[PDB]
Amino acid sequence: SGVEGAAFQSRLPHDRMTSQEAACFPDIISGPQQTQKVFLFIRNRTLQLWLDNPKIQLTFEATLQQLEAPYNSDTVLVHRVHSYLERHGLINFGIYKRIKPLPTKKTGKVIIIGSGVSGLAAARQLQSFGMDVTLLEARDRVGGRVATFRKGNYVADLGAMVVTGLGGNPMAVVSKQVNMELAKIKQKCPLYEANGQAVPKEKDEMVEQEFNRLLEATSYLSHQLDFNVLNNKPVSLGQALEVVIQLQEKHVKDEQIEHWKKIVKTQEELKELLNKMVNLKEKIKELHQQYKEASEVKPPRDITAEFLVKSKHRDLTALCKEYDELAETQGKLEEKLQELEANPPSDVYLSSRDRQILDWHFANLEFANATPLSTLSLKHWDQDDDFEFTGSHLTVRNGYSCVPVALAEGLDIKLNTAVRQVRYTASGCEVIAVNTRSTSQTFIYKCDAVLCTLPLGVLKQQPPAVQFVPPLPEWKTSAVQRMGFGNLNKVVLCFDRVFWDPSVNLFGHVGSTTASRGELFLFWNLYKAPILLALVAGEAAGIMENISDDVIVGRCLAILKGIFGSSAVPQPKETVVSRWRADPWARGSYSYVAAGSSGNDYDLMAQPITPGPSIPGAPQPIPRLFFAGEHTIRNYPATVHGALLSGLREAGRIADQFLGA
């Protein structure tokens, strides 16, 4: 459907009211079913309208115009719904032509710390709601961890690079508003082992299947066996995988034992039988002599001597019967033995090469969570899986920076201004910053509310880069401590010519050791110009930051020479290497759910701070210090869209507090 697809594209169930909706519309959700469906239709239709043309503001009047009866019956209901959607940023977000220009009378003053996507998105919204907004940004540019490299026709992203599917993704709206040259990325990704040769197809498929089975098993270990604490410490995904791998090794050995044990049981049956046959053969030998002797007595003979010959004949054929029936039994146990000798179980769980290729998939997981697997929560690392968007992933061929630059249009942004201290009290706030180029130049900004979008890396910094006065409460600082803030880096290689397969966007390189599994493990060919981009993930990321570009570029070229041939790989014209952990305004790449943490910590990161009263016995103050960013959004962590969404959420919470609901 079109109305139901609008709900889907706004991350909403089409046939049901959400918790956020219940709060603003309690009368409707506690009321009769028919009125809920009217609400739901109005909601879904208004979204559809906005989504069909997100380049222009959708007004309440234009919305009401385009509804039919019986939905246009109640016009307060339509107004309530429209305002809710606008306030929460589900419509009229991003960059659109305003119909009635913005009133010049500004209510309230907000300082936003940081002009990445979370800050920019909040700022736009707050301006549109009629607040006075100023953003303080330590860098000489906007965008933050959206950081695009530009030199000549070379354009490559060092931070965010990919739109992770359009189905449900607010960046779909942004792509209709800003020219991002979105290009689909094809899934095909061949692996090349350390020597430079394709992993052969059958092995590739077997290791991958085993990888997913191993992962499925860690999940099983977590949810069914409640294997989440070990030595009074939370179990990490890395540990769990180790344990699972050990148990597969155990079983391979148990299986060999069981097999060789039934070979001995059968050989011992045979031993017993062969002894029985050797004894009977000697019994037969003697008894034959006895019959030979008895029949060499030539006739005529008495009847006892005839009996002797006859009785020994009978006795000798009867024993030859036994021995014939026993050599039957001999023959069948020798068949059973040649069968088991030729049907052995597997010698090993995984070969050396198998474990190397398995490590590549593990590195891919370390890239995804931007951290070593030993840091990931076993129970909760994947806790946001249900909110995955649908569709192909896409490159931003223009350079992702095009997005923050566009979002900065018409906003009061102060660059080269590093916030040093944040003060919040019951009468308001002051933010104290310095000029990054001369740190003596101090600035003081006074406001009703501060929106902190400092990266989790920065918040973690110890000793602190930013001081909060009064200090943040233990509930916030503990959450900051528990959450992970990972690292991930990129090597951009710019050439004069394409020497790789132009129709393949992705290819792996399998490292020789587990320790180096993340090192230049994945390459990307995404851009119009001849650029290759290599990742440094896992444990390699931290370590590679203390190694020079020339060496890192060297190791890249070594790999690529291995795959395409020494004469095919020229020295690149331009190179760049990211060092995100060392960047003082990031202190890492993005968050992950650390062992000991959970999705609930993202909600704690999102909770605003409310100061104590100035004078005792004064009524409860309003909240002053708000938080946004990738680390604040449980369902879309570690992404550009999570950042965007987290900004929209805070603009609404702030507007609700200072302009009233």
Partner: peptide, 15 residues
């Protein structure tokens, strides 16, 4: 998180 995977998306443990 897992949602970031473009190449060889892991499936194991995902519903």
């Amino acid at each position: 998180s897992r949602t970031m995977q473009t190449a060889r998306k892991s499936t194991g443990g995902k519903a």
